[PDB]
Amino acid sequence: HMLDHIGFNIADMKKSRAFYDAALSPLGIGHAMEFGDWVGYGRNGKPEFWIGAQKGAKLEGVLHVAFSAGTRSEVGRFYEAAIAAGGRDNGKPGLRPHYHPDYYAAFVLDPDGHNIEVVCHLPE
Amino acid sequence: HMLDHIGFNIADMKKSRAFYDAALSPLGIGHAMEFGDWVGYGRNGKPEFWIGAQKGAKLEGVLHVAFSAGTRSEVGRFYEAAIAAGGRDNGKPGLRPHYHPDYYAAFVLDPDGHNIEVVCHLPE
Ligand SMILES: N[C@@H](CCC(=O)N[C@@H](CS)C(=O)NCC(=O)O)C(=O)O
Ligand SMILES: N[C@@H](CCC(=O)N[C@@H](CS)C(=O)NCC(=O)O)C(=O)O
Ligand SMILES: [Zn+2]
Ligand SMILES: [Zn+2]
């Protein structure tokens, strides 16, 4: 994999932490680490996804982040949990064959409007 | 790995494409794919890092993206190439032991001010 980690600031840590806690839980993802004023999500102690809430530093415009799912069931569970936590629909779980024949994904906007996806690339 | 891919808009495709072409080349990373109005960087046909240049849609604020290096030599070569292409220094190649004892990295700002890192986590 070419991506090691990413990080960005959001408006409100309480709100964003709650969203990502709920959204990423079905992927077996939790707080891999909390370094200073950042919260790092990851699996098996390896953080890859960092959010911060530095005053005035929040990202503006839409960032797209896609997380990897091992199963289509995980895609669906991410979606349900993210919506329930206040995420806004940006595309229901389903095949996206215009990308490739086995691309199965769902899209939810986070509290700052970022386009958060979970995708499985495998046939089932 | 939990990150599948990311994407965001930048101000000027010619400038950003040139920067990332130069910066990511030492990692064996090139244009894995060009889908519509986006440019996808990746290795072995698998795009992970997408940039676009939609009018008015550019990301504002600082995004941090770190790419994985297999060797410390690669970290250094990324840095030299990124600087030569007009990147701004945000941290020279070297150990960052305050992260962990084998963390070796360099940081360069892209044309839009994003904090681009290449990191090797292995002892050498
Ligand atoms: N509503 C669409 C969302 C598709 C989407 O957001 N795709 C990602 C890339 S995988 C993206 O950033 N698209 C930007 C665009 O399509 O303009 C769906 O349900 O498929
Ligand atoms: N100038 C520093 C840059 C360190 C840096 O940018 N670290 C990343 C995380 S690996 C970051 O986003 N840091 C934000 C901060 O330290 O406030 C260096 O050379 O080490
Ligand atoms: Zn996507
Ligand atoms: Zn970093």
PDB file of C-alpha atoms and ligand atoms in Angstrom:
ATOM      1  CA  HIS A   1       0.000   0.000   0.000  1.00  0.00           C
ATOM      2  CA  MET A   2       1.257   3.472  -0.830  1.00  0.00           C
ATOM      3  CA  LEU A   3      -0.707   5.407   1.817  1.00  0.00           C
ATOM      4  CA  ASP A   4       0.836   5.279   5.279  1.00  0.00           C
ATOM      5  CA  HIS A   5      -1.471   7.696   7.105  1.00  0.00           C
ATOM      6  CA  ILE A   6      -3.472  10.906   6.726  1.00  0.00           C
ATOM      7  CA  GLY A   7      -4.502  13.659   9.108  1.00  0.00           C
ATOM      8  CA  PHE A   8      -6.677  16.751   9.066  1.00  0.00           C
ATOM      9  CA  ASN A   9      -8.515  19.143  11.364  1.00  0.00           C
ATOM     10  CA  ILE A  10     -12.270  19.145  11.876  1.00  0.00           C
ATOM     11  CA  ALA A  11     -14.652  21.654  13.494  1.00  0.00           C
ATOM     12  CA  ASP A  12     -15.678  19.827  16.658  1.00  0.00           C
ATOM     13  CA  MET A  13     -13.820  16.873  18.158  1.00  0.00           C
ATOM     14  CA  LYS A  14     -16.751  15.587  20.238  1.00  0.00           C
ATOM     15  CA  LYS A  15     -19.009  15.403  17.173  1.00  0.00           C
ATOM     16  CA  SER A  16     -16.403  13.975  14.788  1.00  0.00           C
ATOM     17  CA  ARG A  17     -15.015  11.475  17.294  1.00  0.00           C
ATOM     18  CA  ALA A  18     -18.555  10.198  17.857  1.00  0.00           C
ATOM     19  CA  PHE A  19     -19.174   9.821  14.121  1.00  0.00           C
ATOM     20  CA  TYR A  20     -15.948   7.958  13.356  1.00  0.00           C
ATOM     21  CA  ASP A  21     -16.259   5.794  16.482  1.00  0.00           C
ATOM     22  CA  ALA A  22     -19.646   4.625  15.192  1.00  0.00           C
ATOM     23  CA  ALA A  23     -18.771   4.492  11.490  1.00  0.00           C
ATOM     24  CA  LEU A  24     -15.452   2.640  11.792  1.00  0.00           C
ATOM     25  CA  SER A  25     -16.399   0.173  14.555  1.00  0.00           C
ATOM     26  CA  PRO A  26     -17.863  -2.400  12.102  1.00  0.00           C
ATOM     27  CA  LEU A  27     -14.457  -2.495  10.364  1.00  0.00           C
ATOM     28  CA  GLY A  28     -12.728  -3.448  13.612  1.00  0.00           C
ATOM     29  CA  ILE A  29     -11.256   0.042  13.732  1.00  0.00           C
ATOM     30  CA  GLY A  30     -10.865   1.977  16.974  1.00  0.00           C
ATOM     31  CA  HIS A  31      -8.456   4.360  18.679  1.00  0.00           C
ATOM     32  CA  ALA A  32      -5.100   2.893  17.693  1.00  0.00           C
ATOM     33  CA  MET A  33      -3.455   5.852  19.411  1.00  0.00           C
ATOM     34  CA  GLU A  34      -4.025   9.302  20.895  1.00  0.00           C
ATOM     35  CA  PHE A  35      -0.938  11.448  20.279  1.00  0.00           C
ATOM     36  CA  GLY A  36      -1.220  14.903  21.828  1.00  0.00           C
ATOM     37  CA  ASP A  37      -4.276  16.741  20.518  1.00  0.00           C
ATOM     38  CA  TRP A  38      -4.980  14.201  17.787  1.00  0.00           C
ATOM     39  CA  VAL A  39      -7.069  11.065  17.665  1.00  0.00           C
ATOM     40  CA  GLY A  40      -5.679   8.251  15.533  1.00  0.00           C
ATOM     41  CA  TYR A  41      -7.925   5.521  14.195  1.00  0.00           C
ATOM     42  CA  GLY A  42      -6.433   2.227  13.159  1.00  0.00           C
ATOM     43  CA  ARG A  43      -6.460  -1.539  13.515  1.00  0.00           C
ATOM     44  CA  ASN A  44      -3.961  -3.661  15.496  1.00  0.00           C
ATOM     45  CA  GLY A  45      -2.277  -0.667  17.148  1.00  0.00           C
ATOM     46  CA  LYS A  46      -1.413   0.902  13.784  1.00  0.00           C
ATOM     47  CA  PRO A  47      -3.032   4.321  13.328  1.00  0.00           C
ATOM     48  CA  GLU A  48      -3.713   5.446   9.765  1.00  0.00           C
ATOM     49  CA  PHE A  49      -6.475   8.032  10.087  1.00  0.00           C
ATOM     50  CA  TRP A  50      -5.890  11.087  12.275  1.00  0.00           C
ATOM     51  CA  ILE A  51      -8.325  13.849  13.185  1.00  0.00           C
ATOM     52  CA  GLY A  52      -7.580  17.016  15.127  1.00  0.00           C
ATOM     53  CA  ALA A  53      -9.572  20.039  16.229  1.00  0.00           C
ATOM     54  CA  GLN A  54      -7.098  22.918  16.206  1.00  0.00           C
ATOM     55  CA  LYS A  55      -8.923  26.259  16.331  1.00  0.00           C
ATOM     56  CA  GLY A  56      -9.148  27.889  12.907  1.00  0.00           C
ATOM     57  CA  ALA A  57      -7.323  25.035  11.187  1.00  0.00           C
ATOM     58  CA  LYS A  58     -10.238  22.906   9.956  1.00  0.00           C
ATOM     59  CA  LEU A  59     -10.238  21.576   6.431  1.00  0.00           C
ATOM     60  CA  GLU A  60     -12.673  23.329   4.092  1.00  0.00           C
ATOM     61  CA  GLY A  61     -13.963  21.848   0.860  1.00  0.00           C
ATOM     62  CA  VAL A  62     -14.694  18.153   0.444  1.00  0.00           C
ATOM     63  CA  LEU A  63     -12.086  15.549   1.280  1.00  0.00           C
ATOM     64  CA  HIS A  64     -12.806  12.009   0.008  1.00  0.00           C
ATOM     65  CA  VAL A  65     -11.559   9.179   2.212  1.00  0.00           C
ATOM     66  CA  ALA A  66     -12.311   5.525   1.470  1.00  0.00           C
ATOM     67  CA  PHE A  67     -11.699   2.742   3.993  1.00  0.00           C
ATOM     68  CA  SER A  68     -11.184  -0.879   3.004  1.00  0.00           C
ATOM     69  CA  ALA A  69     -13.783  -3.531   3.864  1.00  0.00           C
ATOM     70  CA  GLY A  70     -13.144  -7.263   3.791  1.00  0.00           C
ATOM     71  CA  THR A  71     -16.799  -8.086   3.125  1.00  0.00           C
ATOM     72  CA  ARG A  72     -19.891  -6.463   1.655  1.00  0.00           C
ATOM     73  CA  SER A  73     -21.593  -7.019   5.010  1.00  0.00           C
ATOM     74  CA  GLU A  74     -19.042  -4.637   6.533  1.00  0.00           C
ATOM     75  CA  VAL A  75     -19.913  -1.992   3.934  1.00  0.00           C
ATOM     76  CA  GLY A  76     -23.564  -2.231   4.923  1.00  0.00           C
ATOM     77  CA  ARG A  77     -22.823  -2.103   8.650  1.00  0.00           C
ATOM     78  CA  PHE A  78     -20.601   0.961   8.227  1.00  0.00           C
ATOM     79  CA  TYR A  79     -23.407   2.658   6.357  1.00  0.00           C
ATOM     80  CA  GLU A  80     -26.110   1.873   8.932  1.00  0.00           C
ATOM     81  CA  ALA A  81     -23.896   2.940  11.828  1.00  0.00           C
ATOM     82  CA  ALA A  82     -22.713   6.130  10.102  1.00  0.00           C
ATOM     83  CA  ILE A  83     -26.258   7.185   9.189  1.00  0.00           C
ATOM     84  CA  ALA A  84     -27.504   6.422  12.709  1.00  0.00           C
ATOM     85  CA  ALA A  85     -24.730   8.598  14.128  1.00  0.00           C
ATOM     86  CA  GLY A  86     -25.890  11.574  12.067  1.00  0.00           C
ATOM     87  CA  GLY A  87     -24.007  11.069   8.827  1.00  0.00           C
ATOM     88  CA  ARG A  88     -25.755  12.253   5.665  1.00  0.00           C
ATOM     89  CA  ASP A  89     -26.431   9.829   2.813  1.00  0.00           C
ATOM     90  CA  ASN A  90     -24.208  10.205  -0.240  1.00  0.00           C
ATOM     91  CA  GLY A  91     -24.846   6.767  -1.774  1.00  0.00           C
ATOM     92  CA  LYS A  92     -26.432   3.593  -0.413  1.00  0.00           C
ATOM     93  CA  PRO A  93     -24.624   0.233  -0.196  1.00  0.00           C
ATOM     94  CA  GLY A  94     -24.442  -1.420  -3.584  1.00  0.00           C
ATOM     95  CA  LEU A  95     -22.417  -2.419  -6.607  1.00  0.00           C
ATOM     96  CA  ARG A  96     -20.690   0.403  -8.517  1.00  0.00           C
ATOM     97  CA  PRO A  97     -19.932  -1.507 -11.736  1.00  0.00           C
ATOM     98  CA  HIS A  98     -18.991   1.696 -13.582  1.00  0.00           C
ATOM     99  CA  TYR A  99     -15.817   1.574 -11.453  1.00  0.00           C
ATOM    100  CA  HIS A 100     -15.169  -2.182 -11.775  1.00  0.00           C
ATOM    101  CA  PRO A 101     -17.403  -5.285 -11.725  1.00  0.00           C
ATOM    102  CA  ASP A 102     -16.767  -6.158  -8.048  1.00  0.00           C
ATOM    103  CA  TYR A 103     -16.714  -2.639  -6.579  1.00  0.00           C
ATOM    104  CA  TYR A 104     -19.200  -2.602  -3.683  1.00  0.00           C
ATOM    105  CA  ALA A 105     -19.412   0.551  -1.602  1.00  0.00           C
ATOM    106  CA  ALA A 106     -21.424   3.093   0.391  1.00  0.00           C
ATOM    107  CA  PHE A 107     -20.867   6.819   0.965  1.00  0.00           C
ATOM    108  CA  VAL A 108     -21.740   9.023   3.967  1.00  0.00           C
ATOM    109  CA  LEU A 109     -20.881  12.665   4.685  1.00  0.00           C
ATOM    110  CA  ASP A 110     -19.142  13.278   7.991  1.00  0.00           C
ATOM    111  CA  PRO A 111     -20.101  16.207  10.276  1.00  0.00           C
ATOM    112  CA  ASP A 112     -17.801  18.516   8.274  1.00  0.00           C
ATOM    113  CA  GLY A 113     -19.163  17.386   4.902  1.00  0.00           C
ATOM    114  CA  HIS A 114     -16.292  15.092   3.927  1.00  0.00           C
ATOM    115  CA  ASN A 115     -17.195  12.219   1.637  1.00  0.00           C
ATOM    116  CA  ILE A 116     -16.531   9.028   3.626  1.00  0.00           C
ATOM    117  CA  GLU A 117     -16.659   5.703   1.831  1.00  0.00           C
ATOM    118  CA  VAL A 118     -16.239   2.065   2.746  1.00  0.00           C
ATOM    119  CA  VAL A 119     -15.466  -0.203  -0.194  1.00  0.00           C
ATOM    120  CA  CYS A 120     -15.035  -3.909  -0.786  1.00  0.00           C
ATOM    121  CA  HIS A 121     -13.301  -4.844  -4.066  1.00  0.00           C
ATOM    122  CA  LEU A 122     -13.850  -8.622  -3.880  1.00  0.00           C
ATOM    123  CA  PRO A 123     -16.466 -10.842  -5.499  1.00  0.00           C
ATOM    124  CA  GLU A 124     -18.992 -12.533  -3.187  1.00  0.00           C
TER     125      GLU A 124
ATOM    126  CA  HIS B   1      -4.335  -1.521   5.667  1.00  0.00           C
ATOM    127  CA  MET B   2      -7.449   0.446   6.536  1.00  0.00           C
ATOM    128  CA  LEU B   3      -7.090   3.213   3.923  1.00  0.00           C
ATOM    129  CA  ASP B   4      -8.248   2.211   0.452  1.00  0.00           C
ATOM    130  CA  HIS B   5      -7.909   5.558  -1.332  1.00  0.00           C
ATOM    131  CA  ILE B   6      -8.287   9.316  -0.903  1.00  0.00           C
ATOM    132  CA  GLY B   7      -9.167  12.154  -3.245  1.00  0.00           C
ATOM    133  CA  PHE B   8      -9.337  15.930  -3.154  1.00  0.00           C
ATOM    134  CA  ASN B   9      -9.356  18.976  -5.413  1.00  0.00           C
ATOM    135  CA  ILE B  10      -6.389  21.281  -5.908  1.00  0.00           C
ATOM    136  CA  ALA B  11      -6.046  24.743  -7.484  1.00  0.00           C
ATOM    137  CA  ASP B  12      -4.130  23.966 -10.666  1.00  0.00           C
ATOM    138  CA  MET B  13      -3.801  20.513 -12.213  1.00  0.00           C
ATOM    139  CA  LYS B  14      -0.704  21.315 -14.296  1.00  0.00           C
ATOM    140  CA  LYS B  15       1.207  22.511 -11.224  1.00  0.00           C
ATOM    141  CA  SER B  16       0.030  19.757  -8.868  1.00  0.00           C
ATOM    142  CA  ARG B  17       0.449  16.962 -11.412  1.00  0.00           C
ATOM    143  CA  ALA B  18       4.029  18.124 -11.976  1.00  0.00           C
ATOM    144  CA  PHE B  19       4.766  18.157  -8.243  1.00  0.00           C
ATOM    145  CA  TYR B  20       3.357  14.700  -7.516  1.00  0.00           C
ATOM    146  CA  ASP B  21       4.913  13.219 -10.668  1.00  0.00           C
ATOM    147  CA  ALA B  22       8.313  14.349  -9.379  1.00  0.00           C
ATOM    148  CA  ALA B  23       7.718  13.661  -5.682  1.00  0.00           C
ATOM    149  CA  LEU B  24       6.224  10.170  -6.023  1.00  0.00           C
ATOM    150  CA  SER B  25       8.470   8.833  -8.813  1.00  0.00           C
ATOM    151  CA  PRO B  26      11.212   7.662  -6.387  1.00  0.00           C
ATOM    152  CA  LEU B  27       8.584   5.481  -4.665  1.00  0.00           C
ATOM    153  CA  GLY B  28       7.784   3.712  -7.932  1.00  0.00           C
ATOM    154  CA  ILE B  29       4.485   5.573  -8.014  1.00  0.00           C
ATOM    155  CA  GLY B  30       2.978   6.906 -11.233  1.00  0.00           C
ATOM    156  CA  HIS B  31      -0.393   7.340 -12.917  1.00  0.00           C
ATOM    157  CA  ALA B  32      -2.146   4.114 -11.965  1.00  0.00           C
ATOM    158  CA  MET B  33      -5.265   5.471 -13.652  1.00  0.00           C
ATOM    159  CA  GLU B  34      -6.932   8.567 -15.090  1.00  0.00           C
ATOM    160  CA  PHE B  35     -10.683   8.369 -14.459  1.00  0.00           C
ATOM    161  CA  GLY B  36     -12.580  11.294 -15.962  1.00  0.00           C
ATOM    162  CA  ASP B  37     -11.281  14.600 -14.616  1.00  0.00           C
ATOM    163  CA  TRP B  38      -9.159  12.987 -11.915  1.00  0.00           C
ATOM    164  CA  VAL B  39      -5.587  11.782 -11.824  1.00  0.00           C
ATOM    165  CA  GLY B  40      -4.957   8.679  -9.734  1.00  0.00           C
ATOM    166  CA  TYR B  41      -1.504   7.876  -8.421  1.00  0.00           C
ATOM    167  CA  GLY B  42      -0.665   4.345  -7.435  1.00  0.00           C
ATOM    168  CA  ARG B  43       1.658   1.386  -7.839  1.00  0.00           C
ATOM    169  CA  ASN B  44       0.971  -1.795  -9.858  1.00  0.00           C
ATOM    170  CA  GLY B  45      -2.200  -0.436 -11.478  1.00  0.00           C
ATOM    171  CA  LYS B  46      -3.828   0.234  -8.099  1.00  0.00           C
ATOM    172  CA  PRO B  47      -4.637   3.923  -7.591  1.00  0.00           C
ATOM    173  CA  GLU B  48      -4.771   5.184  -4.011  1.00  0.00           C
ATOM    174  CA  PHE B  49      -4.169   8.923  -4.287  1.00  0.00           C
ATOM    175  CA  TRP B  50      -6.510  11.010  -6.439  1.00  0.00           C
ATOM    176  CA  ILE B  51      -6.277  14.695  -7.303  1.00  0.00           C
ATOM    177  CA  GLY B  52      -8.812  16.770  -9.207  1.00  0.00           C
ATOM    178  CA  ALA B  53      -9.089  20.394 -10.262  1.00  0.00           C
ATOM    179  CA  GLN B  54     -12.807  21.158 -10.212  1.00  0.00           C
ATOM    180  CA  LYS B  55     -13.408  24.918 -10.286  1.00  0.00           C
ATOM    181  CA  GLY B  56     -14.212  26.301  -6.840  1.00  0.00           C
ATOM    182  CA  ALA B  57     -13.902  22.906  -5.166  1.00  0.00           C
ATOM    183  CA  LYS B  58     -10.289  22.988  -3.950  1.00  0.00           C
ATOM    184  CA  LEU B  59      -9.460  21.891  -0.442  1.00  0.00           C
ATOM    185  CA  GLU B  60      -8.595  24.737   1.930  1.00  0.00           C
ATOM    186  CA  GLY B  61      -6.655  24.313   5.148  1.00  0.00           C
ATOM    187  CA  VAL B  62      -3.815  21.832   5.520  1.00  0.00           C
ATOM    188  CA  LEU B  63      -4.289  18.188   4.640  1.00  0.00           C
ATOM    189  CA  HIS B  64      -1.548  15.812   5.869  1.00  0.00           C
ATOM    190  CA  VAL B  65      -0.814  12.839   3.623  1.00  0.00           C
ATOM    191  CA  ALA B  66       2.020  10.399   4.322  1.00  0.00           C
ATOM    192  CA  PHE B  67       3.226   7.855   1.760  1.00  0.00           C
ATOM    193  CA  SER B  68       5.038   4.663   2.701  1.00  0.00           C
ATOM    194  CA  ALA B  69       8.712   4.166   1.818  1.00  0.00           C
ATOM    195  CA  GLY B  70      10.490   0.822   1.840  1.00  0.00           C
ATOM    196  CA  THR B  71      13.887   2.398   2.512  1.00  0.00           C
ATOM    197  CA  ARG B  72      15.347   5.554   4.017  1.00  0.00           C
ATOM    198  CA  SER B  73      17.020   6.198   0.662  1.00  0.00           C
ATOM    199  CA  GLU B  74      13.537   6.542  -0.842  1.00  0.00           C
ATOM    200  CA  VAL B  75      12.620   9.133   1.795  1.00  0.00           C
ATOM    201  CA  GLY B  76      15.651  11.190   0.819  1.00  0.00           C
ATOM    202  CA  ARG B  77      14.970  10.886  -2.909  1.00  0.00           C
ATOM    203  CA  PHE B  78      11.340  11.945  -2.457  1.00  0.00           C
ATOM    204  CA  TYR B  79      12.530  14.980  -0.553  1.00  0.00           C
ATOM    205  CA  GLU B  80      15.137  16.045  -3.126  1.00  0.00           C
ATOM    206  CA  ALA B  81      12.720  15.572  -6.017  1.00  0.00           C
ATOM    207  CA  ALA B  82       9.841  17.350  -4.256  1.00  0.00           C
ATOM    208  CA  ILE B  83      12.005  20.341  -3.314  1.00  0.00           C
ATOM    209  CA  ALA B  84      13.441  20.545  -6.838  1.00  0.00           C
ATOM    210  CA  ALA B  85       9.909  20.587  -8.241  1.00  0.00           C
ATOM    211  CA  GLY B  86       9.016  23.624  -6.137  1.00  0.00           C
ATOM    212  CA  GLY B  87       7.849  22.032  -2.912  1.00  0.00           C
ATOM    213  CA  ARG B  88       8.522  23.997   0.272  1.00  0.00           C
ATOM    214  CA  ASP B  89      10.552  22.457   3.096  1.00  0.00           C
ATOM    215  CA  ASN B  90       8.576  21.355   6.144  1.00  0.00           C
ATOM    216  CA  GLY B  91      11.190  19.006   7.636  1.00  0.00           C
ATOM    217  CA  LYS B  92      14.380  17.482   6.242  1.00  0.00           C
ATOM    218  CA  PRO B  93      15.004  13.722   5.973  1.00  0.00           C
ATOM    219  CA  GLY B  94      15.887  12.260   9.339  1.00  0.00           C
ATOM    220  CA  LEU B  95      14.909  10.191  12.341  1.00  0.00           C
ATOM    221  CA  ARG B  96      11.824  11.343  14.279  1.00  0.00           C
ATOM    222  CA  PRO B  97      12.407   9.328  17.470  1.00  0.00           C
ATOM    223  CA  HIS B  98       9.712  11.262  19.352  1.00  0.00           C
ATOM    224  CA  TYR B  99       7.267   9.251  17.208  1.00  0.00           C
ATOM    225  CA  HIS B 100       9.053   5.880  17.479  1.00  0.00           C
ATOM    226  CA  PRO B 101      12.718   4.792  17.399  1.00  0.00           C
ATOM    227  CA  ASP B 102      12.732   3.760  13.709  1.00  0.00           C
ATOM    228  CA  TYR B 103      10.531   6.531  12.284  1.00  0.00           C
ATOM    229  CA  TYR B 104      12.463   8.117   9.400  1.00  0.00           C
ATOM    230  CA  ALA B 105      10.693  10.768   7.361  1.00  0.00           C
ATOM    231  CA  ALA B 106      10.721  14.035   5.410  1.00  0.00           C
ATOM    232  CA  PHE B 107       7.999  16.649   4.881  1.00  0.00           C
ATOM    233  CA  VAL B 108       7.329  18.964   1.911  1.00  0.00           C
ATOM    234  CA  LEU B 109       4.418  21.329   1.237  1.00  0.00           C
ATOM    235  CA  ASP B 110       2.653  20.793  -2.069  1.00  0.00           C
ATOM    236  CA  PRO B 111       1.610  23.726  -4.312  1.00  0.00           C
ATOM    237  CA  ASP B 112      -1.613  24.120  -2.291  1.00  0.00           C
ATOM    238  CA  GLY B 113       0.171  24.016   1.072  1.00  0.00           C
ATOM    239  CA  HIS B 114      -0.693  20.433   2.006  1.00  0.00           C
ATOM    240  CA  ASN B 115       1.788  18.683   4.262  1.00  0.00           C
ATOM    241  CA  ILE B 116       3.207  15.778   2.230  1.00  0.00           C
ATOM    242  CA  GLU B 117       5.349  13.203   3.982  1.00  0.00           C
ATOM    243  CA  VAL B 118       7.238  10.081   3.019  1.00  0.00           C
ATOM    244  CA  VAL B 119       8.026   7.776   5.926  1.00  0.00           C
ATOM    245  CA  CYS B 120       9.955   4.573   6.468  1.00  0.00           C
ATOM    246  CA  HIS B 121       9.169   2.731   9.729  1.00  0.00           C
ATOM    247  CA  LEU B 122      11.913   0.080   9.496  1.00  0.00           C
ATOM    248  CA  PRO B 123      15.348  -0.097  11.098  1.00  0.00           C
ATOM    249  CA  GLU B 124      18.370   0.141   8.775  1.00  0.00           C
TER     250      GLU B 124
HETATM  251  N1  LIG C   1     -23.323   9.229  -4.945  1.00  0.00           N
HETATM  252  C1  LIG C   1     -22.235   8.473  -5.567  1.00  0.00           C
HETATM  253  C2  LIG C   1     -20.914   8.852  -4.818  1.00  0.00           C
HETATM  254  C3  LIG C   1     -19.703   8.435  -5.662  1.00  0.00           C
HETATM  255  C4  LIG C   1     -18.448   9.049  -5.090  1.00  0.00           C
HETATM  256  O1  LIG C   1     -18.423   9.904  -4.221  1.00  0.00           O
HETATM  257  N2  LIG C   1     -17.278   8.592  -5.657  1.00  0.00           N
HETATM  258  C5  LIG C   1     -15.960   9.095  -5.185  1.00  0.00           C
HETATM  259  C6  LIG C   1     -14.819   8.331  -5.835  1.00  0.00           C
HETATM  260  S1  LIG C   1     -14.917   6.561  -5.466  1.00  0.00           S
HETATM  261  C7  LIG C   1     -15.841  10.585  -5.523  1.00  0.00           C
HETATM  262  O2  LIG C   1     -15.097  11.322  -4.854  1.00  0.00           O
HETATM  263  N3  LIG C   1     -16.551  11.038  -6.577  1.00  0.00           N
HETATM  264  C8  LIG C   1     -16.523  12.431  -6.987  1.00  0.00           C
HETATM  265  C9  LIG C   1     -17.460  12.544  -8.226  1.00  0.00           C
HETATM  266  O3  LIG C   1     -17.967  11.473  -8.634  1.00  0.00           O
HETATM  267  O4  LIG C   1     -17.631  13.680  -8.729  1.00  0.00           O
HETATM  268  C10 LIG C   1     -22.498   6.957  -5.442  1.00  0.00           C
HETATM  269  O5  LIG C   1     -23.414   6.609  -4.675  1.00  0.00           O
HETATM  270  O6  LIG C   1     -21.788   6.186  -6.125  1.00  0.00           O
HETATM  271  N1  LIG C   2       8.494  19.981  10.832  1.00  0.00           N
HETATM  272  C1  LIG C   2       8.098  18.710  11.440  1.00  0.00           C
HETATM  273  C2  LIG C   2       6.818  18.212  10.690  1.00  0.00           C
HETATM  274  C3  LIG C   2       6.119  17.130  11.523  1.00  0.00           C
HETATM  275  C4  LIG C   2       4.748  16.855  10.953  1.00  0.00           C
HETATM  276  O1  LIG C   2       4.201  17.527  10.096  1.00  0.00           O
HETATM  277  N2  LIG C   2       4.104  15.771  11.509  1.00  0.00           N
HETATM  278  C5  LIG C   2       2.752  15.369  11.038  1.00  0.00           C
HETATM  279  C6  LIG C   2       2.319  14.058  11.674  1.00  0.00           C
HETATM  280  S1  LIG C   2       3.478  12.722  11.282  1.00  0.00           S
HETATM  281  C7  LIG C   2       1.748  16.470  11.395  1.00  0.00           C
HETATM  282  O2  LIG C   2       0.705  16.607  10.732  1.00  0.00           O
HETATM  283  N3  LIG C   2       2.037  17.250  12.458  1.00  0.00           N
HETATM  284  C8  LIG C   2       1.165  18.329  12.885  1.00  0.00           C
HETATM  285  C9  LIG C   2       1.842  18.975  14.130  1.00  0.00           C
HETATM  286  O3  LIG C   2       2.900  18.433  14.526  1.00  0.00           O
HETATM  287  O4  LIG C   2       1.285  19.972  14.648  1.00  0.00           O
HETATM  288  C10 LIG C   2       9.233  17.673  11.296  1.00  0.00           C
HETATM  289  O5  LIG C   2      10.168  17.968  10.529  1.00  0.00           O
HETATM  290  O6  LIG C   2       9.146  16.621  11.966  1.00  0.00           O
HETATM  291 ZN    ZN C   3     -13.912   6.431  -3.471  1.00  0.00          ZN
HETATM  292 ZN    ZN C   4       2.753  12.031   9.281  1.00  0.00          ZN
END
